[PDB]
Amino acid sequence: ASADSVRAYLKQIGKVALLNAEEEVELAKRIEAGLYATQLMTELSERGEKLPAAQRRDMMWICRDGDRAKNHLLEANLRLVVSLAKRYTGRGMAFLDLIQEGNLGLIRAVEKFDYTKGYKFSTYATWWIRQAITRAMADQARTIRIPVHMVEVINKLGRIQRELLQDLGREPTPEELAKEMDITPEKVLEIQQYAREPISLDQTIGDEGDSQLGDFIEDSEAVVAVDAVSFTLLQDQLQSVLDTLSEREAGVVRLRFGLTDGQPRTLDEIGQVYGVTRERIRQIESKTMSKLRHPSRSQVLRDYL
Amino acid sequence: RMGHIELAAPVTHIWYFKGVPSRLGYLLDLAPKDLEKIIYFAAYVITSVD
Amino acid sequence: AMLDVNFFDELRIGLATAEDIRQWSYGEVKKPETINYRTLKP
Amino acid sequence: NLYRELVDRYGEYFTGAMGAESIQKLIENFDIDAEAESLRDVIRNGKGQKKLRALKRLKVVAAFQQSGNSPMGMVLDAVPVIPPELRPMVQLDGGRFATSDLNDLYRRVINRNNRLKRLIDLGAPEIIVNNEKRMLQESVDALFDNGRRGRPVTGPGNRPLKSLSDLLKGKQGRFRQNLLGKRVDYSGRSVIVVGPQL
Amino acid sequence: LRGSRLGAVSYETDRNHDLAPRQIARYRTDNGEEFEVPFADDAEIPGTWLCRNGMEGTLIEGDLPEPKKVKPPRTHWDMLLERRSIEELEELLKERLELIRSRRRG
Amino acid sequence: RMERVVRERMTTQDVEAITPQTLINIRPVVAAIKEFFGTSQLSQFMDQN
């Protein structure tokens, strides 16, 4: 089978021989020389030079040799990436994705780099690789993406609550944790509420594998059937009652409450389209409302409310 | 309404390849285990020659 | 289809080409984000 | 290693590649017609095991020939995303969200595709790019079926996930379930008694 | 348990007659495919748009209102050039130059 | 499980400084007993009609 891509990868990365500070200095010098060489080739390419054949040929050799050295060092330290990444499994992301993100962090560490400080590569890279793995595990782990500042404070709360659970024996209280972390209890509660892991709708709530949670969740947003027909009836009854009003009255009501287009017109607009003052509109409004409050045309529409 | 994802590199199915019998395996005239080394990046392939 | 009837008279399966795919889609997802953590909007 | 020495001394005279793009080309340079005629010749004149192996191959090749479907459908370029509501993110009262486990698989594929794009832009060594292409392929395969081509992709409680196939296979797929029986409105039940008067 | 996708529902007749008139706008993608985008009449039509294909597409109408290019992502060259000076990489380049050309003349 | 954790921590912990209070983790025992009495096939509600 050999289906384990973990193995398909480890047996692959066990090939390239491991290097030392001596070869590291040589490699870094070659990489830097190549990057400088390609920078100058780009500079002299623009508006520039009909280069000598030997000079041009071997500076291209340097340009490619720098990439060879870069890739050689990357292959050399893949093993280091694995050794640093193994410790962040058992939770969240999967091992392979972590290895790839740690590889990205390693590209960053070798890129943004220096050797004149006279330090073995791992010292500096370890920091970057750890940072990259943590960055990935923070962003691309939880389904609902929670950003990294919130993630770090979540982890600090988790550590404090756990350690003080063991220290106290009893579970810490929200004020105990709020005082410890020098934050407020409502913030403690908010963070705890943000640590909740979305359960899966795919779970055998029954003992045998036939009953799923998704088959017992009333959707409290569906059409109530009776509510929709009731709204249609309300539309009809209200339309009739308003038609009992006079033309001016029916118009003012419909426009004032947007029964004709869904746009609620206000007093100034209504007075403008009727060519009167808004005080007159408000008076017609009050008169009409009082007329409708009369039980004759009121009790018909009471039930809908 | 549906979406799509523009992939940066091609990818192959799992139904017309691994499911017995390998429909692709017959199609290109290769055994299943042999192809399981070609479409999981563990063996080169020459595409043409003169 | 998008608009359906009860006159359905033939259900025809067949593998789909990517040319048919980028003409189905009404957009393209590119970010692995489900719903905002704070406002709970997509 | 041999391939490298062969290329950098014989860079002309041929093209050779690795992976899903090279097989895309293979299907591109596969002629169903000629192969089909050869298979007809074999099944017509061959014998024994060769004839039968041609038969089974002859089946699928003519199947593609008669469908005129150009097997490219096996190399899956741009990948379609199922509508959001069929994979609901219901919020059970109390803030506990409820995924559908197709969210998680889709997220995995999208993460790996994004990272692959990134690595391609950087120009990582062939090791990393090929590993990430392998992981894309693995996750697309997982989404279209979980439990095939290796151990199941699992999650909390080491429960295997629910790929699209596990929604359309076995006894819990639509094709062996609610497409058999449906709860109905305007219904009731009760215990029965005998009426010797009706 | 009772839950519902965070959202809302409306109960209003879908009148197909009295609406706000639309105005279909064309947005060419880089490959050149056209993707209709209905807009309202009194509506400032943007020059560019994210189309149905997913790549940025400009109006078929001639606007070309400046690319609005951004600063490039920090490159490996940027991360190297700060800690090290040009003339300082010069001597290393000449060391490699003499190395490889000594191989050449050999 | 407790023993596994205890010995791992003991190895990481420095000598001449530690004590069974600092070695024993009592989370596993509580977790096991809880997952037994609750959430188990063989711990059923007493049917008492």
CB D137, CB B11: distance < 8 Å: yes
For residue A118, the chain E residues in CB contact (below 8 A) are none
**Residue bearing tokens 């007659």:** E17
Pairing assessment for the beta strands E37-40 and E22-25 based on DSSP bridges: antiparallel
Residue E55, token pair as written in the block: 């790549």
For residue E72, the chain D residues in CB contact (below 8 A) are none
Residues in Cβ contact with A43 at an 8 Å cutoff, skipping those fewer than 6 apart: none
Q: Which residue of C has its CA nearest to B8?
A: C30
Of F37, A127, A214, nearest in space to D88 by CA: A214
CB A76, CB A16: distance < 8 Å: yes
Is the CA virtual torsion D46, D49, D51, D53 positive or negative? negative
From the CB of residue F47, how many other CB atoms can be counted at a distance below 10 Å? 5
Of D54, D32, D31, D35, nearest in space to D43 by CA: D54
Residue A137 in 3-state DSSP?
helix
**Residue bearing tokens 């090749």:** D61
Query: What strand order describes the sheet that includes D90-91?
Result: A199-200, D97-99, D90-91
CB B12, CB D27: distance < 8 Å: no
Alpha-helix runs per DSSP H in E12-84: 76-81
Residue D174 in 3-state DSSP?
helix
CB D14, CB B49: distance < 8 Å: yes
For residue B41, the chain D residues in CB contact (below 8 A) are 18-19, 130-131, 133-134, 137
Q: Which of B8, B36, B38 sits opposite D117 (nearest CB)?
A: B8
Question: CA-CA distance, C6 to C12, in Å (whole number)?
Answer: 16
Does residue D186 belong to the interface with chain B, where contact is any CB pair within 8 Å?
no
Distance from CA of D42 to the nearest CA of B (A): 14
Does residue B14 belong to the interface with chain A, where contact is any CB pair within 8 Å?
no
Does residue A2 belong to the interface with chain D, where contact is any CB pair within 8 Å?
no
Residue D59, token pair as written in the block: 């089946």
Residue A182, token pair as written in the block: 């020098």
- Report the half-sphere exposure of F15 (CA within 13 A, side-chain side): 1
Residue D99 in 3-state DSSP?
strand
For residue D136, report the phi and psi dihedrals to the nearest 5 degrees. -55, -60
* H-helix or E-strand spanning residue B48: strand B45-49
E3–A220 C-beta distance less than 8 A: yes
A145–C37 C-beta distance less than 8 A: yes
Q: Taking each helix axis as running N to C, give the angle between helix A247-256 and helix A226-244, from 0 to 180 degrees, rounded to the nearest 10.
A: 140
D79–C30 C-beta distance less than 8 A: no
Residues in Cβ contact with A28 at an 8 Å cutoff, skipping those fewer than 6 apart: A73, A113, A115
For residue D88, the chain E residues in CB contact (below 8 A) are 5
Q: Which residue of A has its CA nearest to F25?
A: A166
Residue F10, token pair as written in the block: 């003991």
Q: Which of A9, A12, A202 sits opposite D101 (nearest CB)?
A: A202
Residues in Cβ contact with A114 at an 8 Å cutoff, skipping those fewer than 6 apart: A124, E83, E84
Distance from CA of B35 to the nearest CA of D (A): 10
Q: Which of C27, C30, C40 sits opposite E52 (nearest CB)?
A: C27
Burial E43-70 (b: 16+ CB within 10 A, else e): eeeeeebebbbbeebbbeeeeeeeeeee
Does residue A201 belong to the interface with chain E, where contact is any CB pair within 8 Å?
no
Residue F38, token pair as written in the block: 């609750």
D74–C21 C-beta distance less than 8 A: no
With helix as H, strand as E and coil as C, how does A200-233 read? ECCCECCCCCCCEHHHCCEECCCCCCHHHHHHHH
Question: CA-CA distance, A196 to D95, in Å (whole number)?
Answer: 8
Method: cryo-EM
CB A275, CB A268: distance < 8 Å: no
Residue C35, token pair as written in the block: 């719903």
Q: How big is the A-D interface in CB pairs under 8 Å?
A: 100
DSSP, res B12: B
Of D84, D25, A59, nearest in space to E98 by CA: A59
For residue D166, report the phi and psi dihedrals to the nearest 5 degrees. -70, -5
Terminal Cα-to-Cα distance of chain E (whole angstroms) = 83
CB A195, CB A154: distance < 8 Å: yes
Of E57, E11, E49, nearest in space to E30 by CA: E57
Residues in Cβ contact with D18 at an 8 Å cutoff, skipping those fewer than 6 apart: B41, B43, B44, B45, D130
Residue C28 in 3-state DSSP?
strand
For residue E1, the chain D residues in CB contact (below 8 A) are 92-93
Q: Which residue of D has its CA nearest to E53?
A: D78
Measured CA distances, A164 to A131, A159, A170, D192, E55 (Å): 27, 8, 8, 61, 52
Q: Which residue of D has its CA nearest to E75?
A: D122
Of D39, D66, D65, D63, nearest in space to D53 by CA: D39
Q: How big is the B-C interface in CB pairs under 8 Å?
A: 23
E11–A54 C-beta distance less than 8 A: no
Task: Please name the chains neighbouring E, where neighbouring means 3+ C-beta pairs under 8 angstroms.
Answer: A, C, D
From the CB of residue F22, how many other CB atoms can be counted at a distance below 10 Å? 13
Residue B30 in 3-state DSSP?
coil
Task: Please name the chains neighbouring B, where neighbouring means 3+ C-beta pairs under 8 angstroms.
Answer: A, C, D
A146–C37 C-beta distance less than 8 A: yes
Number of residues assigned to chain F: 49
**Residue bearing tokens 């024993």:** F24
From the CB of residue B29, how many other CB atoms can be counted at a distance below 10 Å? 12
Is the CA virtual torsion A207, A209, A211, A214 positive or negative? positive
From the CB of residue D141, how many other CB atoms can be counted at a distance below 10 Å? 26
Beta bridge partners of B46: D16
Residues in Cβ contact with D70 at an 8 Å cutoff, skipping those fewer than 6 apart: C17, D27, D64
Measured CA distances, A100 to D5, D59, D108 (Å): 29, 42, 13
Question: CA-CA distance, E81 to E89, in Å (whole number)?
Answer: 9
Of D112, C33, B7, nearest in space to A139 by CA: C33
E83–A37 C-beta distance less than 8 A: no
Residues in Cβ contact with B36 at an 8 Å cutoff, skipping those fewer than 6 apart: B18, D149
Distance from CA of D44 to the nearest CA of C (A): 30
The residue among C21, C22, C39 with the most chain D CBs within 10 A of its CB, best to mutate, is: C21
Question: CA-CA distance, A216 to A109, in Å (whole number)?
Answer: 51
Question: CA-CA distance, A29 to E89, in Å (whole number)?
Answer: 9
Q: How big is the A-E interface in CB pairs under 8 Å?
A: 78
Residue A70, token pair as written in the block: 């870069």
